[PDB]
Scaffold this active site. Sequence first.
Site, short mmCIF file in Angstrom:
data_model
loop_
_atom_site.label_atom_id
_atom_site.label_comp_id
_atom_site.label_asym_id
_atom_site.label_seq_id
_atom_site.Cartn_x
_atom_site.Cartn_y
_atom_site.Cartn_z
N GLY A 102 -0.69 -9.41 -15.99
CA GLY A 102 -0.02 -8.37 -15.18
C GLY A 102 -0.53 -8.21 -13.76
O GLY A 102 -1.65 -8.61 -13.44
N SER A 103 0.30 -7.59 -12.92
CA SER A 103 0.08 -7.60 -11.47
C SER A 103 -0.74 -6.43 -10.89
O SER A 103 -1.97 -6.37 -11.09
CB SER A 103 1.43 -7.77 -10.73
OG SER A 103 1.23 -8.13 -9.37
N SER B 238 -1.55 -2.35 -9.94
CA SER B 238 -2.62 -1.37 -10.19
C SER B 238 -2.21 -0.22 -11.13
O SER B 238 -3.09 0.41 -11.75
CB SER B 238 -3.15 -0.80 -8.87
OG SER B 238 -2.08 -0.22 -8.13
N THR C 204 -3.08 -3.17 -15.47
CA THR C 204 -3.21 -4.65 -15.49
C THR C 204 -3.06 -5.26 -16.90
O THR C 204 -3.72 -4.83 -17.84
CB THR C 204 -4.50 -5.13 -14.77
OG1 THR C 204 -4.18 -5.38 -13.39
CG2 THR C 204 -5.05 -6.42 -15.36
N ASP D 93 12.40 3.51 -14.86
CA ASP D 93 12.05 2.26 -14.19
C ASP D 93 12.50 1.01 -14.96
O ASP D 93 11.74 0.07 -15.15
CB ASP D 93 10.54 2.22 -13.91
CG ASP D 93 10.13 1.03 -13.05
OD1 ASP D 93 10.90 0.64 -12.14
OD2 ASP D 93 9.04 0.46 -13.30
#
Lengths: 260, 262
Positions: free
Chosen positions: A17-18, A20, A23, A129
Amino acid sequence: DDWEIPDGQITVGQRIGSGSFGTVYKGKWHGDVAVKMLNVTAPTPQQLQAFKNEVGVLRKTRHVNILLFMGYSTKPQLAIVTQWCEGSSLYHHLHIIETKFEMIKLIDIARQTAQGMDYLHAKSIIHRDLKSNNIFLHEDLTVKIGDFGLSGSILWMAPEVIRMQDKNPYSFQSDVYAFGIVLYELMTGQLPYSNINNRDQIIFMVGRGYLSPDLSKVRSNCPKAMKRLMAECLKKKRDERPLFPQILASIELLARSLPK
Amino acid sequence: DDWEIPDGQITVGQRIGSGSFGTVYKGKWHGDVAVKMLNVTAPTPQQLQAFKNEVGVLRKTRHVNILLFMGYSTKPQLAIVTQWCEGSSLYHHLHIIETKFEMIKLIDIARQTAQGMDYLHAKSIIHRDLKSNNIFLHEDLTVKIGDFGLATEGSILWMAPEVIRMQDKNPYSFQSDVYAFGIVLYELMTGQLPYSNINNRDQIIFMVGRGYLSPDLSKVRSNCPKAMKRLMAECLKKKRDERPLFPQILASIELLARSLPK
Ligand SMILES: CCCS(=O)(=O)Nc1ccc(F)c(NC(=O)Nc2cc(NCCO)ncn2)c1F
Ligand SMILES: CCCS(=O)(=O)Nc1ccc(F)c(NC(=O)Nc2cc(NCCO)ncn2)c1F
């Protein structure tokens, strides 16, 4: 009884995962899992409380199209555990590896995505989202919606949300707009506004209502009912947007109409 | 919150079969679902409680290799709602439609079956009734162990000696489960049911009971890995304290699994 995995049965491995917000890694725990490190070490009772309450929501979900929550852990450091998905994200497929899907498969992926969301709204859970980035196509046929629990992904935001007219813009309908864009993704192979190198413009334009997704890119063989259903989901006035009860119907009607 | 699904929401479709105190139907509820209809019509509080408990057991499980519990209903009658499966039972595949699964799949089906069991044990849940009919093979590659709710409270081929001879009040243990596993292990490595060469059930039951009879391992297809056949036997141990536990079982499968694909 309780869903808190005790200390250290979880073998954090491979990073994934990217940013902040959390992760993400591949792990092991009675087989392969993914783990989202919240990486906010030493909470802080009670953010421990707000968090465990966030969990309350994930454990409200038991359904095939929703990424299966398996547990959470506190002790090594706050984290969430889900089933691992052998496959790739609707995003990844569509916009990085460029997978040419059958039109049929496209309709199906929408249907399953539709299914899942409807279930979420059934249990009164706004996703807040959705994006092609959060729809994982497990084993290339099962659609798993994830990342709803608890910036630079604004293409899916309904104007109502972009423009921040009050405290709570996030509705079922806000979610329907997002879905409407991932419909678009499926139907055109591409992103909206693919031809505009500047973000804040896109924000400003969709916000003030000058820039709407180009629907003339829905290739030929996307059936009218589906294209019209896209039209529907994107209507900028949210009241005019259909919810998933009805969204599911329109698809499942043209689903019968074309396995031949 | 409560996993009670209000009457009138579940569309009941095709009757698909019987299974432990109920009938099972394919159904619509937020898309396809399975529905076991607990035909013990209107309890009887608190058997109404008994239901609630065994359900309590179910909602404790959240695993890929465990048939997804989705909800229950007291309301119209008693019922358990779980995910539907595009696929057939492992028993069906094997002994009715006669699928010819390649070894690699068979080891994989095995591994996954273990996977789920380990989980269930990890959560102190004895299955008490594992068989090839319980393991469902969804979209023909994902194992989903179903059918262990109630089962506290039909098929003896999977039943371990220690169980068959009643002897004490509780013969069901992990190892009991392991045995059953052992049998579907045999099932997969042979595509036979054990003792296919005896027509008398009592006889079978009796003899396994005292371990005069036991599965004829020599029947494992020519290329079933050495390690596998060895493992099958460890799972089919007559003395219940000689069977391995699912941690260790996974251990030895994953090994032979990597010693293989290329
Ligand atoms: C029901 C989920 C709870 S949530 O907080 O909404 N989401 C959430 C929580 C923890 C996680 F590890 C993840 N997973 C991810 O963010 N990604 C992910 C990718 C993957 N395959 C990658 C190979 O393509 N398999 C499983 N998960 C979540 F989505
Ligand atoms: C998950 C634990 C709950 S349980 O009470 O232990 N078992 C239990 C409870 C309700 C059910 F509907 C079922 N299902 C079944 O018995 N069979 C089944 C077959 C199928 N298609 C294959 C037909 O082609 N898809 C889904 N389920 C259960 F296994």
